[PDB]
């Protein structure tokens, strides 16, 4: 896996790949690594597929119970802490989860929380998670500015996953894009690396290491 999410002028970009592996065996190229918790909350998945999938859908149930009891949408901080406190109870049991809880509320604004299986919970503007995180960081950091447009930010997130999809063997398949605003999250499509790579290579003039 490679996943990322970064905060900018126009909200939050979230981008993930879709590959799933069992050792060197490519088991799937069409996995959904973004969980839609509610119209204002997203969750990213990296590590153990079952661990991430099971517990983040469980998180969505807990976030729903909150707004029934409190007649108010759960904060991104409170949502992320439910998950971090949960995995902390299991610490040492062997859970493998690298997640990011991304969303918008009135009191917080656009917010991203990194949450992993050994109990780490961090608020921040930029995170990349998964085995291909470093490859995404390389492209993302070197092109990141706060004043990116929604169009340029969407592309940078997409291009960063593509970079990791290319170099990291355990990342690939397709890119899933999301944009989180004050009005909620907006899906920006599934982009197959099979076509995207050559399209990006030709139009951008990058990837000169590859035989054109």
């Amino acid at each position: 896996t490679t996943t990322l999410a970064f905060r900018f002028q126009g909200g939050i970009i979230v981008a993930v790949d879709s590959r799933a592996t069992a050792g060197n065996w490519v088991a799937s190229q069409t996995v959904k690594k973004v969980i839609e918790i509610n119209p204002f909350l997203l969750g990213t998945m990296a590590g153990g597929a079952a661990d991430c999938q099971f517990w983040e859908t469980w998180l969505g149930s807990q976030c729903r119970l909150h707004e029934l009891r409190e007649k108010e949408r759960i904060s991104v901080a409170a949502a992320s802490k439910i998950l971090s406190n949960l995995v902390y109870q299991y610490k040492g049991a062997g859970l493998s989860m690298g997640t990011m809880i991304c969303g918008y509320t009135r009191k917080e604004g656009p917010t991203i929380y990194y949450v992993d299986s050994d109990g780490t919970r961090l608020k921040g503007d930029i995170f990349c998670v998964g085995s291909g995180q470093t490859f995404a960081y390389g492209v993302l950091d070197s092109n990141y500015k706060w004043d990116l447009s929604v169009e340029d930010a969407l592309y940078l997130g997409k291009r960063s996953i593509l970079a990791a999809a290319h170099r990291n063997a355990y990342s690939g398949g397709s890119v899933n894009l999301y944009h989180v605003t004050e009005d909620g999250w907006i899906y920006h499509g599934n982009h197959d690396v099979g076509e995207l790579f050559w399209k990006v290579k030709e139009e951008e003039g990058s990837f000169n290491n590859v035989i054109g």
């Binding site: 069992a22 996995v31 999938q53 049991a93």
Partner: protein, 222 residues
């Protein structure tokens, strides 16, 4: 030291059509280099037009199928004989599998049937409950042999339209039940040739709105 797991071999295969779905599996059961049975079915009709197979360690496989079948029964009791949809069955199975997260069922599970729009559906599970709906999935010992062939023939991967300079992809389309059974049979004969744990017999369960039909074919017994 006592090892609670074993490998019973065999391989399974699920393909989804437009208004149907098939779930196939070989009938060979093995341990190490010995054949236990040439005909031991591991693809089951679980009711509500859901077929299921849990391939790998047969004891865990049988336990899981048994528990799911029971889950279907109690779903009827508790919810006024409501039909368990394939998507609801899939989520239920995730909880069965993840319930034993720290002492897993050593199986690859596949279920097949029709979704609530009447379209063919195949769901596949890892041992601890991560699941995904797909048009296509092979599971078990010969999955690594069969799956890439399915990518090529069912989902038309790496196939481009002739003369288009590798620019236009071969268009996706649903396969007929006749064409799907051809791919299943050729997949299993190919797997039988090159994998020692696969052979003896092939049992296919076909699911349509009319019900669950069965077909059986001989495979090489060496």
């Amino acid at each position: 030291q006592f090892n609670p797991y074993g490998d019973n071999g065999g391989t399974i295969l699920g393909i989804a059509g437009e208004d149907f779905a098939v779930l196939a599996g070989d009938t060979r059961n093995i341990t190490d280099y010995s054949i236990n049975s040439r005909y031991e079915p591991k693809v089951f009709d679980c009711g509500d037009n859901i077929v299921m197979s849990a391939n790998g360690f047969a004891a865990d496989g049988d336990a899981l199928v048994k528990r799911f079948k029971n889950s279907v029964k109690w779903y009827h009791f508790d919810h006024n004989d409501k039909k368990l949809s394939i998507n609801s069955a899939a989520r239920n199975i995730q909880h069965l599998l993840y319930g034993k997260r720290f002492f897993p069922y050593y199986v690859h599970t596949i279920i097949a049937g029709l979704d609530e729009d009447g379209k063919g559906a195949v769901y596949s599970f890892d041992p601890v409950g991560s699941y995904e709906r797909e048009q296509c999935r092979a599971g078990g010992a010969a999955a690594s042999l069969i799956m890439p062939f399915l990518d090529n023939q069912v989902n038309f991967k790496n196939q481009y339209e002739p003369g288009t300079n590798g620019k236009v992809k071969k268009p996706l389309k649903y396969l007929s039940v006749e064409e799907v059974i051809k791919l299943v049979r050729d997949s299993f004969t190919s797997a039988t040739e090159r994998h020692i744990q696969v052979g003896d017999g092939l049992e296919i369960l076909i699911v349509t709105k009319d019900g669950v039909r069965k077909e059986f074919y001989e495979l090489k017994r060496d």
